[PDB]
User: What shape does this take?
Amino acid sequence: SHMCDAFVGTWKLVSSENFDDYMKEVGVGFATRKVAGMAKPNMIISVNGDVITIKSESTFKNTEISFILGQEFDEVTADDRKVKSTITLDGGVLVHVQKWDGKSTTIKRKREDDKLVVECVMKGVTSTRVYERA
Ligand SMILES: O=C(O)c1csc(COc2cccc3cc[nH]c23)n1
Assistant: This one.
């Protein structure tokens, strides 16, 4: 057992709040927001040694990132930003910071009861997205 055990698995989106406004804050254009906001992604989290992989699959886009905690990587986000990302574990919360064009946004993933809760923040705009096991 180990570092991310309680996050590993296949998760499905069950609710979202304020995601359109979060995406507006990030700078996402109208048509991408509409199609992305309609998506119902499955998130697939796995661990092999020290390497964590997070996949997000939907009709909008399929993404995959692999990383080592605390070790920066370059990521092309689903909305086509080129960002410098670092993911760390802080008190049992996976904290994903993206840096680009002098801006920053943070995506936190938390296990709460039987759910996996995703909190996306930029400036004062937050979105909360709740996933359940698939
Ligand atoms: O609920 C999630 O898993 C979740 C929330 S935010 C995230 C990764 O970032 C993004 C994904 C899709 C679209 C956009 C647009 C801006 N950022 C985006 N994944």
Summary: The longest strand covers residues 103-112.
